[PDB]
Amino acid sequence: DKKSYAGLEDVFSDNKSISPNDKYMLLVFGRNGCSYCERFKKDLKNVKELRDYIKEHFSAYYVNISYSKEHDFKVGDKNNEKEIKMSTEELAQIYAVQSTPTIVLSDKTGKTIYELPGYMPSTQFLAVLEFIGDGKYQDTKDDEDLTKKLKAYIKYKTNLSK
């Protein structure tokens, strides 16, 4: 049920239909009773810079693995895209979800750029979204390079909140 993220319907689109829609994609996997999922949602609610940025740059979906829905999952290139109807369990599985909240950030074709498996405080989390949303991930050479550049960028944004 959508009561999972009551009050955040301005951020999360209905997860019956999951795709980037000419935006970066943000997938949040959560569940009932997880204190980290609860803190993550308060940050989305109460940090305006975060809330605005997500709404500006991402198609965001909240998948509660406490339940089992079906999802039309549409990803891929302009010329060739695949739409598959799959269950909550099948969706979680393709992203190897094993803790909550797991956050998946993907490009406009639904190719995974980065995955975070845990709650991150809002200052750092916003820096991760910016790196992706402003396209800075593109100026990298591999996974080792993207990670170093990401970790550098988070530190800089951390210094910036003083």
UniProtKB/TrEMBL annotation:
Can you tell which superkingdom this protein's organism belongs to?
Answer: Bacteria
This protein's UniProt keywords: Signal
Q: Which residues form the Thioredoxin-like fold domain?
A: 20-129
Coiled-coil spans in chain: none
What is the disulfide pattern of this chain? C34-C37
Q: What is the recorded name of this protein?
A: Thiol:disulfide interchange protein (DsbC), putative
The range of the complete sequence contained here reads: 56 to 217 of 221
